[PDB]
Amino acid sequence: MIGEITTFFGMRVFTDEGRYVGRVEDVILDQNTKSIRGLAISDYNKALIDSHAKGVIIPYRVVKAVGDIIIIKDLFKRKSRVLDYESRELIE
């Protein structure tokens, strides 16, 4: 549970649905709340992230487990908008 910050470095991140997210490149800190703010990710999965940045930042609150890998809540999905005259829902 408690350990050193260097452990994050190089760890692969997966979602709790088994899907690869990427490799931790850095850890984003906050003096005001004495807490980890986010994880900087690189070598990141294009199938899941539409983005052209060198790396992306995942907020730390979606981290579920840190072991040999980091598991996060799978947030790489699309919500469906509700339609008033259709029981089906829309995706754009």
């Binding site: 549970m1 408690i2 350990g3 050193e4 910050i5 260097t6 994050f8 470095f9 850095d26 850890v27 984003i28 800190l29 906050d30 003096q31 004495k34 807490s35 980890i36 703010r37 900087a40 730390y60 609150r61 981290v63 840190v66």
Partner: protein, 75 residues
């Protein structure tokens, strides 16, 4: 907000100006995400911080800024 690697081996100083050492590592809780300690490679002999494996154990409660010099107080 500060990336952790940008704190790599920075110098750590007290409120008066004493050079405490160079940052070695950072202790954190992985579930909570709370930052717990600093681990500073010593250079001077401040009695205000206890030691383990030859590093200063600075509670993160005592950190007061983290710009070009890590600044630390006794309380």
């Amino acid at each position: 907000y500060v990336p952790a690697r940008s704190l790599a081996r920075k110098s750590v100083v007290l409120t008066d100006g004493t050079v405490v050492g160079t940052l070695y590592n950072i202790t954190v809780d992985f579930k909570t995400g709370t930052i717990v300690n600093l681990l500073v490679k010593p250079e001077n002999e401040i009695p205000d911080f206890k030691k383990e494996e030859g590093l200063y154990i600075i509670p993160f409660e005592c950190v007061r800024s983290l710009k070009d010099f890590i600044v630390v107080d006794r309380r």
